[PDB]
Design a protein around this ligand. Structure first.
Ligand SMILES: *C(=O)/C=C/N[C@@H](C(=O)O)[C@](C)(Cn1cc[n+](C)n1)S(=O)O
Ligand SMILES: [Cl-]
Ligand SMILES: [Zn+2]
Ligand SMILES: [Zn+2]
Ligand SMILES: [Zn+2]
Length: 358
């Protein structure tokens, strides 16, 4: 890699690892469209297995970017419309509060207060229906954004219904395979489990536990190479030969709602570039990122703006991830770690690197 990249990566990430006690980390810096890879530490401490470019990490909520693009691909196929009512795809959702809640609201967390989590007691389709049937909204739809796995999670599940495919089969055939993400998995196959890093929480080795709608909201695992290719695909959608997927990527970066200097896409979140770094750093703290905030509709949604900081944080019990990119500059970064360390530390490091390379 260019010396300038090597230097800023060492001086930014090695101290981050020292400061945050991260056991293993993989970073990809995309510079002029090309990924440069860096690894540190161990995927499995006790076995002394190093992190490599083939190590699988839990992406956590970075998974929502795949769900948003899959939903965009379904829009481009004409299979769904964001204005469609939820009940078109789930008629059994007869409760009156669902009158007026659209797929747009589900995808963008604006349904009116769907909770952050699907309750752990939900273990079957019948349990899931009772959960949504009994939910009482705190706000009218389309007025407040409250980040929630139960919101975009339902969006993903319903968006694939017209295809007749399971969510996992839809994601594999319509996103992973066309983009040659051949080491990205909702369910890690046994033959690949040897590359699956352990996450570390308070010293103990942990993996994410199953949960309702986990694949849609936080359940994808991937390598640093595949995630760099994901960033390249979102930086340069016109390079993708499948037209519905090219357009789905663009639709996921459209701006549907604004709150402060942040715009809500499908999975992705966006800000105008140049960005105020303190805003993205401070705003990534869960105290803010998970709080309810009023939104203003953008009608029609702004088509994907090239001069944007586009990003998503993600976490599981034992992992912490971050992806950010700037289409106008063909600049991006992926940071995968097997410790869940505070989001602001992730964003600060990413901005220090990309700012140095602009
Ligand atoms: C996106 O990053 C969301 C991640 N969810 C985390 C979290 O809430 O901190 C997990 C995945 C929570 N969770 C709920 C149900 N299950 C199986 N995990 S993590 O702490 O376990
Ligand atoms: Cl140094
Ligand atoms: Zn040094
Ligand atoms: Zn791969
Ligand atoms: Zn392989």
């Amino acid at each position: 890699a260019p010396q300038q990249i090597n230097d800023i990566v060492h001086r930014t990430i090695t101290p981050l690892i020292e400061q945050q006690k991260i056991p293993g980390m993989a970073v990809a810096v995309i510079y002029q469209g090309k990924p440069y890879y860096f690894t540190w530490g161990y995927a499995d401490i006790a076995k002394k297995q190093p992190v490599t470019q083939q190590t699988l990490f839990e992406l956590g909520s970075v998974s929502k970017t795949f769900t948003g693009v899959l939903g965009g691909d379904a829009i481009a196929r004409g299979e769904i419309k964001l204005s469609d009512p939820t009940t078109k795809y789930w008629p059994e959702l007869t409760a009156k509060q669902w009158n007026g809640i659209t797929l747009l609201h589900l995808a963008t967390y604006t349904a009116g207060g769907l909770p952050l989590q699907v309750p752990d007691e939900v273990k079957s389709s019948s349990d899931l229906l009772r959960f949504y049937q009994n939910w009482q909204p705190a706000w009218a739809p389309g007025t407040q954004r409250l980040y929630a796995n139960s919101s975009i999670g339902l969006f993903g599940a319903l968006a694939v219904k017209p295809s007749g495919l399971s969510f996992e089969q839809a994601m594999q055939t319509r996103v992973f395979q066309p983009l040659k993400l051949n080491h990205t998995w909702i369910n890690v196959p046994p033959a690949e489990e040897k590359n699956y890093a352990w996450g570390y929480r308070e010293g103990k080795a942990v993996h994410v536990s199953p949960g309702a709608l986990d694949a849609e909201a936080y359940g994808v695992k991937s390598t640093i190479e595949d995630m760099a290719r994901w960033v390249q695909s979102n930086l340069k959608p016109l390079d993708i030969n499948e037209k519905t997927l090219q357009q789905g990527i663009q639709l996921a970066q459209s701006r549907y709602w604004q709150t402060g200097d942040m715009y809500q896409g499908l999975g992705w979140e966006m800000l105008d570039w140049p960005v105020n770094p303190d805003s993205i750093i401070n705003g990534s703290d869960n105290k803010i990122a998970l709080a309810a905030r009023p939104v203003k509709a953008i009608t029609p949604p702004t088509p994907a703006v090239r001069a944007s900081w586009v990003h998503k944080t993600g976490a599981t019990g034992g992992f912490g991830s971050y992806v950010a990119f700037i289409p106008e500059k063909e600049l991006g970064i992926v940071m995968l770690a097997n410790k869940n360390y505070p989001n602001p530390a992730r964003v600060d490091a990413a901005w220090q690197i990309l700012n140095a390379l602009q």
